[PDB]
Subunit: 89 residues, 2 copies
Amino acid sequence: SITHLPSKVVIQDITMELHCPLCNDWFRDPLMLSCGHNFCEACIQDFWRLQAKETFCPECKMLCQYNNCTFNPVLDKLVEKIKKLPLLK
Amino acid sequence: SITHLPSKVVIQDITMELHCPLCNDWFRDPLMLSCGHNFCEACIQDFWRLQAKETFCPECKMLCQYNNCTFNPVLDKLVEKIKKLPLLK
Ligand SMILES: [Zn+2]
Ligand SMILES: [Zn+2]
Ligand SMILES: [Zn+2]
Ligand SMILES: [Zn+2]
């Protein structure tokens, strides 16, 4: 995209990217799946253990293998920082 | 950390987290290594091909295996968004 965006809209977009789509809260110990999507470790583990018959990604439906999941620590750092951001608009 | 931070300081901290430590520019097609650190794909590939005798992480020095690297697409999305943020302070 090549359009200017309202400051508040950009902050909100950034914030949506740091929210887990399973719990709709801030990522906590996010795992990244083979497709590149991220979920709280607890959220994706419970989804797979409890709701899903194969280990697929809830967002894109691609078949991930459990053993290919990896921690995504940069997301923890970004969550910590942005929660401290004063929203001046 | 449990201290309030200046808005501008928080934006700058967030921005440092979205910069590749090898090139000091915005992440472009970042790969995440087994240790959880991220670098532009081109940057870490050139580092390993050209400067380094084993595939270690330039930040933490841990021995990563090349085949365990993964794309970290969330970082591309965050780079795109934050570059559009008007800096009002
Ligand atoms: Zn979650
Ligand atoms: Zn996915
Ligand atoms: Zn780079
Ligand atoms: Zn590292």
